[PDB]
Design a binder for this molecule. Sequence first.
Ligand SMILES: Nc1nc2c(ncn2[C@@H]2O[C@H](COP(=O)(O)OP(=O)(O)OP(=O)(O)O)[C@@H](O)[C@H]2O)c(=O)[nH]1
Ligand SMILES: Nc1nc2c(ncn2[C@@H]2O[C@H](COP(=O)(O)OP(=O)(O)OP(=O)(O)O)[C@@H](O)[C@H]2O)c(=O)[nH]1
Ligand SMILES: Nc1nc2c(ncn2[C@@H]2O[C@H](COP(=O)(O)OP(=O)(O)O)[C@@H](O)[C@H]2O)c(=O)[nH]1
Ligand SMILES: Nc1nc2c(ncn2[C@@H]2O[C@H](COP(=O)(O)OP(=O)(O)O)[C@@H](O)[C@H]2O)c(=O)[nH]1
Ligand SMILES: [Mg+2]
Ligand SMILES: [Mg+2]
Lengths: 431, 428, 430, 428, 91
Amino acid sequence: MREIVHLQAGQCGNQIGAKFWEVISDEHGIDPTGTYHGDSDLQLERINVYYNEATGGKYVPRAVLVDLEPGTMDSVRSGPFGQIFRPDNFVFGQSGAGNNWAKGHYTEGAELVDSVLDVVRKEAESCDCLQGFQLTHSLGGGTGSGMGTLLISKIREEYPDRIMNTFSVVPSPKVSDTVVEPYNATLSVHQLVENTDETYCIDNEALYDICFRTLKLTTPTYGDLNHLVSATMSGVTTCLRFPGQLNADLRKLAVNMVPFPRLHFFMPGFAPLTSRGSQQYRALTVPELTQQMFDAKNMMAACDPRHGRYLTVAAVFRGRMSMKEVDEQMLNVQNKNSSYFVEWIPNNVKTAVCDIPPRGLKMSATFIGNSTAIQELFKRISEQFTAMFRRKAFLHWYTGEGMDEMEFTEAESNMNDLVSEYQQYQDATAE
Amino acid sequence: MREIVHLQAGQCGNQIGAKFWEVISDEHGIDPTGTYHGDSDLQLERINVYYNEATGGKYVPRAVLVDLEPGTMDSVRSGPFGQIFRPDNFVFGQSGAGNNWAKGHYTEGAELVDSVLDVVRKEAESCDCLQGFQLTHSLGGGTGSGMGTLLISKIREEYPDRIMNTFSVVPSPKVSDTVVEPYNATLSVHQLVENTDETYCIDNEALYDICFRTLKLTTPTYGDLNHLVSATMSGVTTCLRFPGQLNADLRKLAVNMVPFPRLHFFMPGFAPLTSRGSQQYRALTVPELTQQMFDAKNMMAACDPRHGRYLTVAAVFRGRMSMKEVDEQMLNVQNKNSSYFVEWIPNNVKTAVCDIPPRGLKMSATFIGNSTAIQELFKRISEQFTAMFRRKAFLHWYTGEGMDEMEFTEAESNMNDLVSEYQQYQDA
Amino acid sequence: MRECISIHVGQAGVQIGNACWELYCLEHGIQPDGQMPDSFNTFFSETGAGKHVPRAVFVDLEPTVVDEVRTGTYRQLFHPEQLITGKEDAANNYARGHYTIGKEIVDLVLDRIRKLADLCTGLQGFLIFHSFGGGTGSGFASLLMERLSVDYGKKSKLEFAIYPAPQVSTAVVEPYNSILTTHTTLEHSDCAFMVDNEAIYDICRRNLDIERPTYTNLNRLIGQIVSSITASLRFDGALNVDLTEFQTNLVPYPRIHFPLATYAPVISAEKAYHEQLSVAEITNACFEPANQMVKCDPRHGKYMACCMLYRGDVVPKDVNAAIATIKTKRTIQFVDWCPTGFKVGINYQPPTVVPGGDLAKVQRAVCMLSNTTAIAEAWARLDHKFDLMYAKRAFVHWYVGEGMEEGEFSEAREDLAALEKDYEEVGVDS
Amino acid sequence: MRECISIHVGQAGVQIGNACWELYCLEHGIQPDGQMPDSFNTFFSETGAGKHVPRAVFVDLEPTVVDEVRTGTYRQLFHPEQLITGKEDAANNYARGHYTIGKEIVDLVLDRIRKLADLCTGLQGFLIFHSFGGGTGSGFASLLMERLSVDYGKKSKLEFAIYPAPQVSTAVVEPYNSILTTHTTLEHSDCAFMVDNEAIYDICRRNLDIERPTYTNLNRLIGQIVSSITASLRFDGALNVDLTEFQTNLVPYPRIHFPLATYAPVISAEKAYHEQLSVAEITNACFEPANQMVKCDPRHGKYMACCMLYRGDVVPKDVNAAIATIKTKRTIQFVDWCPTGFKVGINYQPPTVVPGGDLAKVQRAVCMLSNTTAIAEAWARLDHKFDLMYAKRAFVHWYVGEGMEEGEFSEAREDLAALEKDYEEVGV
Amino acid sequence: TVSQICPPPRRPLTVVDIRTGMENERLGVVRDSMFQNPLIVKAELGKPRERSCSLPGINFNYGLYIRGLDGGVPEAIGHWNVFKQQPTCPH
Ligand SMILES: Nc1nc2c(ncn2[C@@H]2O[C@H](COP(=O)(O)OP(=O)(O)OP(=O)(O)O)[C@@H](O)[C@H]2O)c(=O)[nH]1
Ligand SMILES: Nc1nc2c(ncn2[C@@H]2O[C@H](COP(=O)(O)OP(=O)(O)OP(=O)(O)O)[C@@H](O)[C@H]2O)c(=O)[nH]1
Ligand SMILES: Nc1nc2c(ncn2[C@@H]2O[C@H](COP(=O)(O)OP(=O)(O)O)[C@@H](O)[C@H]2O)c(=O)[nH]1
Ligand SMILES: Nc1nc2c(ncn2[C@@H]2O[C@H](COP(=O)(O)OP(=O)(O)O)[C@@H](O)[C@H]2O)c(=O)[nH]1
Ligand SMILES: [Mg+2]
Ligand SMILES: [Mg+2]
């Protein structure tokens, strides 16, 4: 009908998918045995987007958990919702990439892409009408940042029409845990720009800033950041999963969202971030939601939107409200922040409403923005990568895999062209 | 009516058939004493197909057991359903062939073929209307790969119209336990091409792989391998012993997947094979069976139909379902994998359905496929056979039996002819 | 049913047969009288009094080696006339045991062989134990089995015999016997298990910790290997292998019937307490050059045929798992004309152990019988040392004095030169 | 599953392995017999009756050093054949352990690992300890890396070694061994962790208040460091770091693979009672030049890469803050081409404490692997010392008498000279 | 290792066991640790060296033993697991 299959690449994307399946299992009322104990018919009217039916009324996620290291799968099984996943779905190698992009993409990834592809083809051929795939991974590792791009290219050739989104985690320079991280990001971004319908850029530093200031959590584990990101995807797909007064879905967002095929990198936003001072009630309106939305503190990107021009903005509302004040607030911010929006595109905001509130809450809203700010990240990655690459530092690990030196050059050329046309689209002039 | 005699040759054949008669007795509700304690009336309506009636509601198997070595007879006698048989049907020699093909076919086989044929003739004339015979044997032995070919030649001239069936076991290149194994096979397959309606290539190595991968067995024994074979050959006659949604038997199939008389080499399959961990998940459904119908890890053969074209496919289904999706999973799987099916034969697939599911199970089926991939197995054996024959190695044992030298040359010529036309039918 | 008769020749065969028929009786549970307090029907036969008598003939030209068995713990177990003795021995002379002293008791020994063969219904084969060194074990052993070939053309005759060690030696005129014995084991033998004593010393000192072993310890290991080959005959198994099938899958040409035996795991329980003993481990021990029973290097000669005899708590899958590794080993070589060179044997019951013995019990075991072309270098070593004694005619007068024509000394040497050159033909790969 | 095989070389390796494997046994719960009363699977292998044999080889050339362990408390725990001995040693002669005495026992060591490699399914890395002073610990250690490199082409090998102290020395002819060993640790290794005793001498006195420590007091610190490296592999953590991961973010050029370790907090019970510890304080001590266990000042050089292994009750929030403070410090410098020089690792299980040991139980710890250019000057004192030995030909007749040609001495010095200039290329 | 096998696990030798006449019998002062210690244990005639550390029961040491709780293919293929849901207690 409209089914989504989830690729779960790397340790970061592995935990991301785990927590996502947990939170939407809560949303759809699925016990960790895999049956149903909920109350409403809208809770299971449209589950089969993400779940597959099994005898005795069992439901299983449509996920493939792929990794080059079998250590993470043990933690996945030891987790709470560990037995809900299909035993044949996990695909793992025996030797990891060691955070080496060439090793992940070419050396060891060729040994596992066959089983990844055949499992994913089984899952795609199980459903009648597939909408698209969702891939969760980071750009700083060896497996998710590596062979994940190989999967992307292979399934791009196999299914061109089905949509493709990547909930990609981008490394930060201010806090980084990997030295070859610029090399992995450089050789992954070239794959991402060529083969991706849409990309969501998640910054762990931004999540840490949010939990420090907006939420004021004393002890942020990775569970909190993952819960935020899982709420982000839940807000993306809640319009698809449940009826709303104004319905939409991923294709609705993407077609209206993407002005040119080169540009598909987007910054998400999640409105009801309440600390203990704001844990009083949800007695709030679309004004308060929008003010919390449009502050760049509440953003989870690595690039201030005020430093660029907002190309396009999209907002999806979870819960039941009236569209009048919603439209008034969107027109309000559009007329207020005139310079931050592009002139050649009137009415830069796309709006959607899903009547069903998120579980454990009664108001929520998500936002997907394409702005000129994202060009600040690619240039900074380029500054790190050029310093890394000028003295051939840390290059023997890549060259021993059997790859040539021109690949880094063409990758950085692709990014330089991308940021150049990005600057041109910023400084579009006249009419 | 429609009777089958279960001729049994060699230690491989004797054990495989022994596990059979345990399995099919359970499906008909027969104790090791021999009586009928079954509940449903349909459990005892067509038992005369495989069983001759005995006193007190007893059903002696219609099987005759042949082996040069009497040691295996004591083993099957001491088995669970050991006393079920008739010791008037054990016909055995005193000296084995020692895995020598020439010893069985000429030297020691001529002394025991008469007594085997006498028992077979007694069973052949016992029932009014035979459907045919059934042989289980291995191609890497001295008895099953030896006199078993000789018994086939004598029977074919005796009963030409009757369908004979052989679920032969083909030696594996990766796993082999006999050095003279290429010599026995190359001289036995020449008996197969001349006189055989239908042959199946069951390989022990793929039995090992399924137990390693599908069933996830830590310690699978040889009983597990035969029990799987006990499921597979039982499904080809379930439409025979039992009424079905669409009825079938051996003849309705055997006419359908034999385009030319030379090619009767196939790859059997079995539907509901999972390990215990997989049982908790999944849904009971026929699409899962169809995914297991043409499943990669399903079939028994030591060859891969990526590398050839499927000439014909047959699928007999066990259990009560609806007809529709069975013909649609049929239809779609033809459409997408179009190159892998031959173009000169429209509707390459054939199906049958039997209403009664297997004991303890709700759903099952059996896979019957003719593909070009079975030629992968033959040119492997010639690679082993030619190297051994180029230096006349291991030749004096066969030469000591009085046989010539030209019999090797004509046998390999027939296989070289056989794979030549088999390759020709791929590129047509 | 399947039966085997013992024709143990020489002092070595008598001592080994003492060790063997011990291991045989405690394997089934036969009391020293010979009464059970039909797996025995391969090695024991009933009488009117319900007593089980071994199918053995212990024959010697000296009485004392058999006399201690007559005074041993098993005096009443054995049939006294099967214990055949002689007044005077060959005294380490091949010619004395072949033409002068052997012929006196030829009729009595063969008539005993006839009577024991008349007891059996279907005879599978004969097992013969002797040595290439002693005069009784070489000359007299040659003549009886020349005559046994014409009495029983089709009956199998395996040859397990003791090889003069490459360095240590008990006698000096041993190689004259060895060169003059090796012709009979060619035209009248089905398989040869030539082993040297010196190989047992090294494995007893390393694996079993025995720094001071004696022939009781050597003979127990020999009996275990003989217990291993006949185990499938005595007991059931998943893949029961008789003598005939493994006979066929070792002998590519009638001239080559010299496989090398190997047993595993042979490990003292001091080592076996903390050691993991698996199927994949033990077959690697069978392939060990230091664990080989013949003092040659396995890497020098590629393999044509191998026999695997697993025994105990074993499964085919780990056997399949074991063998698949052994083919993926580069430096281990096989001949070009044998792509598959194995004969897998599986049994149920694990081997038994004797009290006061050496071997730690193991739930699983494996015997390896490998026909390789590396063994022929040991014959070449024999051919050198026979050359530098025959050139100046040392000790020749003893053999000539018995009535032996000196040209046979030459012809026996040309037999081995032709025999070794045939092993080289197998080593040539097209 | 993960595996690390221990190839302890020399008397230093025997006593270090005594400290390590004791700490390893208490870390899992292994009794001295070797029975649990699979985190252990990276260091122990299961055996028959439920014992866990340590996956180590103890090798030496003088018998008595291992003989104490054979009579030690863990005598039944280890494998006697894993304990490899020798009749005669090199006596601080590199040539003797490389060409005369080592070649008798080259094969024996390679047969023991043959046993071990069969036990392992996927081996993660190769852990070797030796020293640069002793003859057996240098020459024999050199040849095994020669043979291991061609046997294990793709495998990872780490180089824990004792670098001879700048001021104090237990030998006179040691720099000849040290100079001739640089060729192996440059071309036959992946990561090298030269530590001198003299700096550990200062740290034990200065911080742990123990005025009279023994060789065992240094060894427990070494075992704690190695325990910190593998703690990610043994047990789960928020950021589990494999050997391949930090090998990647440590080696800018194939020649530069000599990081400097750093462990903290190392404090007595009396001192830790009045000192509350946090993340900010423990990392700050790790960049103190007084706590470096290599007699060099990183303030005299520039960092290129730093791997960072937390352990205990640590939170990533405090991790990011601690890195933020350190990056904002002119005293701590970095090379111009490495804007981000960190490799963050987090474990859950705190380090354990040995009974009768030195370290007090602290809820959190910190391990640092700093690759700086300041380690280069430590070699610069060796060539000076080596030059004033070789110019007048001191002790040369001992090496030449073994059969080693005098031209390699000049080459090895020229090799070490080339390493120093390559360190200067990074410094620019 | 004491629990292994009902007969006592094989043990280091004792001075009562040294009896009279074996090769490890010498005068002076005798302590059990001298014969126990492998460095000054004296080897015997055609016997394995006694164990310096107590070794398990002779009846069963075993290299590796496992029967497997797979369930058996007859049971698995007949009784394919039909889904069973637990009847939870009242709440
Ligand atoms: N392994 C082993 N070999 C033995 C034993 N007894 C004798 N031999 C071998 O037999 C060779 C000599 O022959 P013997 O067995 O002593 O005596 P024989 O075979 O009767 O021949 P004669 O000495 O002429 O009577 C010696 O070289 C030994 O190697 C034994 O108990 N164990
Ligand atoms: N840190 C530390 N170093 C040790 C220890 N034992 C030996 N060493 C070092 O090892 C060097 C001498 O070599 P040894 O370990 O004693 O013995 P070896 O490695 O076999 O070399 P040879 O004595 O020549 O056979 C000395 O210079 C010490 O620095 C130890 O327990 N701790
Ligand atoms: N936001 C977030 N990032 C994570 C989490 N776990 C790991 N990461 C990131 O993932 C990176 C390491 O991923 P890695 O294990 O190398 O991925 P792989 O090589 O593809 O398997 C680190 O830089 C972390 O920042 C998490 O729970 N949340
Ligand atoms: N699949 C299977 N193969 C068997 C069985 N028993 C024996 N074999 C195979 O048969 C071969 C030996 O057959 P053999 O006993 O010589 O047959 P015979 O000469 O006809 O009596 C071996 O390669 C075994 O792999 C069995 O029960 N199942
Ligand atoms: Mg004698
Ligand atoms: Mg030393």
